[PDB]
Amino acid sequence: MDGVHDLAGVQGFGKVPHTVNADIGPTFHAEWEHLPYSLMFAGVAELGAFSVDEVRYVVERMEPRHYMMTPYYERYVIGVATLMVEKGILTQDELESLAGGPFPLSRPSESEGRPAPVETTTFEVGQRVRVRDEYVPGHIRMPAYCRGRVGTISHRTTEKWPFPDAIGHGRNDAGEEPTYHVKFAAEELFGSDTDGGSVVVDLFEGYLEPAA
């Protein structure tokens, strides 16, 4: 999904609000902040109502202006609440009644997702690969800066996981794939307009194809 969450490479932001080893304060700065992650885990591990991938996607589905003005932990309060409503576990009415006011949610999905590709290649360390030049309206773990770009495999995972584009929509056809650490030259991604060396993206097999 080409949403505003796909921030890598966006220009115009100011300074990172940190200098190294500065005090970051306590883990939680407010008494509610542990709730989004804890209730995520209740949904995922206790209820089996959704996957972690569905949590990423529901956050991506926040209305774009809403996403941009909402602090991190609040996005996950909204996301988890949205999933609970979408899955039929809670109603928005009861959330708003308990909250004592408006509790707007993420926008409905505009894609049913897609299955794990049937045709993929097992790649090896040192091989050159291209990120498939594809556009996916639902959840995808490919940041746009690497779409259609060429890099070299530095690692093939020794474990496999469900394809996000499927499990992020709660589909039954996510299968399992390894991922690949794909190293791109900075100039491959941003031309002359970068001060970096290389960028390594951890990409599912289904996002990749042989280069050349």
Place this chain on the structure above:
Amino acid sequence: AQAPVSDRAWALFRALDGKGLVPDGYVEGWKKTFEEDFSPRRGAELVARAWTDPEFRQLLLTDGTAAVAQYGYLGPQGEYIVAVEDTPTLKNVIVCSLCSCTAWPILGLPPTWYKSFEYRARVVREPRKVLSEMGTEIASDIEIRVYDTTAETRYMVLPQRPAGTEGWSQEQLQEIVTKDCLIGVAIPQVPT
């Protein structure tokens, strides 16, 4: 228009808890895990061991998961671990440009700055400038490599060991390996 966030967060809790969907002590248990167990002190311990034990260093760099498992530090958002090695010509830095993905058990939960739009947008494209602004100068003869945490690999940086620490104990070395060293935005410093 929105109700206060605290009211919304507790509404979510109460709506689920009131239906019997949240085990007793559940969110309290997670809070404790997040605050007390998940810690960059764990990553620091791993680094100090790697620095003093060539055999462990090799294990950590070839099978991060196995190395971390030896200490018992695998956990949520830290089940498949890759450690990335800084060298005299290479500096590694970690981000999750798409959200906040972080090796929780060994680095701790991500700090506000790491999850900021500023860091997520900028470090992938201008890491040298970002690190410089944050207080870390990386020379032109050093390649900066940014790892974007886009799938299930969870990363830690194994930073270079600074001169002046020769013969230090693991406890002494652990003290200079900070959260920011593990993320890759800081280089370990020898205290005056």
